[PDB]
Structure 1
């Protein structure tokens, strides 16, 4: 996360981190339920074997809420291809259930029509992660959050060097140096409505980070709500 601020105690409880054999995070995810994590399909190609950590805000210090979970099943969307990054979505089922507690809780899945009419027409959503704090920098040891404006769909397609498919949407800033970044990929984009946070996106891709005239591109979760529901069965 470039810019933004720390997730303070209890503020981003649905954050998950995909960690490799070296215990290094390489992608984020979103807690959907005690057994399921939402993430990006493209993240699955960035590590051989990985686990999921939850309840962590500072990777350098044991806070008492951390829990690592092994993955039982990977459910990647069969239509994902690396050439387009279309359908950039996967669900993970964990071997053991997540025990919710301080800093560990699921984000809500919305209904499609309502989310697109009411959530995605809000001014902003919130993205979070342990990713780089600038395009050329190292990964953050602190979990960060960032308010990102929803961006006009036409403006985004005009700004983009790559096709924006029906399964993507854009968020962030034209020139302001705030954005998600590498390492945040797969992580939560949520939208707040009356003090309840709903999953609205998956951090997917962007041309660099916080570049002028470029936006962050997110998987449009509302397009995949039936797919997610099926995968969790």
Structure 2
């Protein structure tokens, strides 16, 4: 995150940090959708060109962390992974189409004031909220506490013209008109993290997207691009129902 603001305590309880065990390294952001399931971007786990090829035993996640430098005993929790699931049609050689993955924890995590799951959208929610101009929220680390930025969804024709990458219906893009001031930006480093929106119908937070790649921030590009969560909800539901419990 760049040009963002300090998040308030417990403001993003579904925030998850994906780490490589050795050497210890923060790989990506992720999100909690249940006591045993975490959502992230596939490219965080599988990207051959850069030898990014992990199995469940190479990683771990930390949940409930507000500070990236201070160890919050009794608050933050560590969870090991039981299994990883990558969308069978995930395309990394071309455009990151269907850039999504699920990770099942070895043991259920205990919810608290700092650890709570986010909701996945249904048809009504997606249809009403995923429109140009409507703002969503992205959380990550500045580049010290968790940072936050609110960003407007961009018209699809505009998104397509702002990148050389082929944009599919399983993607959407957001961000400010760079020509309109020092605005916050989601960054490549925020990959895997959630893009959330609060429903005005039931006041619940829904994860509408997953940071797939960012062309602004530390590059001369314009927007951040996201995996369209609702468009892939059938796969998500299929996996949890078949391998959950």
**1:150 alignment counterpart:** 153
**Equivalent position to 1:207, from 201, 204, 215:** 215
Q: Measure the CA separation in 1 of the matches of 2:174 and 2:220.
A: 13
Deviations for 1:128-150, whole angstroms, at most 9, x for unmatched residues? 113x52xxxxxxx4211110101
TM-score (norm 2): 0.86
Deviations for 1:149-191, whole angstroms, at most 9, x for unmatched residues? 0111111101111111111100111204421113311011111
Partner of 2:158, secondary structure, is: helix
Partner of 1:183, secondary structure, is: helix
**Equivalent position to 1:173, from 176, 198, 212:** 176
Q: Measure the CA separation in 1 of the matches of 2:31 and 2:222.
A: 25
Q: Is the 8 A contact 1:72 1:93 kept in 2?
A: yes
**2:15 alignment counterpart:** 15
The higher radius of gyration belongs to: 2
Partner of 2:189, secondary structure, is: coil
Q: Is the 8 A contact 1:168 1:219 kept in 2?
A: yes
TM-score (norm 1): 0.90
**2:124 alignment counterpart:** 114
Q: Measure the CA separation in 1 of the matches of 2:221 and 2:45.
A: 29
Instruction: Report the RMSD for the aligned CA atoms in angstroms.
Output: 1.7
In the TM superposition, residue 209 of structure 1 has moved relative to its aligned partner by 2.3
Structure 2: 5+ residue runs without aligned partners?
A: 47-51
Number of aligned residue pairs: 224
1:210 and 1:222, CA in 2 relative to 1: closer, same or farther beyond 3 A? farther
Partner of 2:188, secondary structure, is: coil
In the TM superposition, residue 82 of structure 1 has moved relative to its aligned partner by 1.2
Q: Is the 8 A contact 1:179 1:210 kept in 2?
A: no
5 Å-filtered alignment, 1:71-82, equals 71-82=81-92
Q: Measure the CA separation in 2 of the matches of 1:30 and 1:157.
A: 27
Partner of 2:177, secondary structure, is: coil
